[PDB]
Amino acid sequence: RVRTLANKSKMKVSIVQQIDRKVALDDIAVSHGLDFPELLSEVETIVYSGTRINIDYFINEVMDEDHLEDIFEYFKESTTDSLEEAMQELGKDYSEEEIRLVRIKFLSEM
Amino acid sequence: VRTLANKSKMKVSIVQQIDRKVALDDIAVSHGLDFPELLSEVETIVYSGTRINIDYFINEVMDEDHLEDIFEYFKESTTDSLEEAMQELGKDYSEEEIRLVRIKFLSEMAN
Ligand SMILES: [Cl-]
Ligand code: NA
Numbered sequence: 001r002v003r004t005l006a007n008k009s010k011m012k013v014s015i016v017q018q019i020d021r022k023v024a025l026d027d028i029a030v031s032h033g034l035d036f037p038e039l040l041s042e043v044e045t046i047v048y049s050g051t052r053i054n055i056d057y058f059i060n061e062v063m064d065e066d067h068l069e070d071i072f073e074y075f076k077e078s079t080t081d082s083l084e085e086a087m088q089e090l091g092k093d094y095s096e097e098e099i100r101l102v103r104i105k106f107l108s109e110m
Numbered sequence: 111v112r113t114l115a116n117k118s119k120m121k122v123s124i125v126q127q128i129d130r131k132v133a134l135d136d137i138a139v140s141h142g143l144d145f146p147e148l149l150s151e152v153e154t155i156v157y158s159g160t161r162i163n164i165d166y167f168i169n170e171v172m173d174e175d176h177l178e179d180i181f182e183y184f185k186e187s188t189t190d191s192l193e194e195a196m197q198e199l200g201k202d203y204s205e206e207e208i209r210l211v212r213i214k215f216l217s218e219m220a221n
Contacts, residue, residue: 048189079157079220081189107188 012046015039022057025101040100047107054108059101067094071102081107121155128152131166134210149209156213161221168210176203180211190216 011032018028029039046053059068074090075081086099120141127137138148155162168177180203184190187198195208 048187048191048194050186050188079159079216082157082191085157110188 012042015042016046016051016053019043019053019055024061025055025058036097037100040097040104043104044100047104052108053104055101055105059105063098063101067098068102070094071099072106075103075106121151124148124151125155125160125162128162128164133170134164134167145206149206149213152213153209156217156221159221160217162213162217164210164214164217168214172207172210176207177211179203180208181215184212184215 015028015032018031019025023031025039025043026036029036032039032042034042043053043055071086071090071094074086078085081103083096083100083103086103087096090099124137124141127140128134132140134148134152135145138145141148141151143151152162152164180195180199183195183199187194190212192205192209192212195212196205199208
């Protein structure tokens with residue numbers, strides 16, 4: 001009913017557990033009453049904390065393999081992981097959502 | 111009037127100044143920039159792939175334990191984001207200290 005830091009903390013644990021069980025990210029979003037970009041923001045929070053996740057099962061199903069390869073190469077060769085920088089370089093070809101997803105994979109693989 | 115040509119030239123000059131070990135605050139003044147504006151230009155340079163070394167300046171102006179703690183933060187971080195660094199470090203270190211060490215770290219690890 002009202003967000004608290006404890007329920008936010010528990011939600012993130014839940015999202016991780018769902019990702020481990022290979023639940024589709026869009027299904028996870030619905031399960032928590034989130035829009036897709038809101039879910040991406042939680043997953044980014046999770047990844048920033050150093051939590052090891054793996055969303056290949058989802059990326060491989062929904063994304064164009066060439067888009068994935070080219071966005072990933074951009075991150076491999078980049079100096080900063082910044083989304084703003086990635087949009088400046090890649091935004092003429094790829095959406096924010098594609099770039100955010102591959103960025104999650106890239107940061108998670110550190 | 112700023113143009114893409116004279117901005118590119120200014121950056122070339124900044125890189126040369128840093129190579130010649132000119133203090134960053136002196137570089138700022140020489141280009142009519144305030145310090146944070148200079149930091150923004152040095153960030154642009156580093157993002158582009160130029161391996162600059164600003165140890166001579168950091169070692170002169172920054173507290174040694176501050177440098178080590180912030181550097182360690184970046185080494186252990188997942189994202190290099192300034193926003194995340196500020197959330198994690200902003201109660202102990204200034205934005206300028208964090209930006210300087212982040213330049214050092216990004217240049218070393220990538221460029
Ligand atoms: Cl992080
Ligand atoms: Na696209």
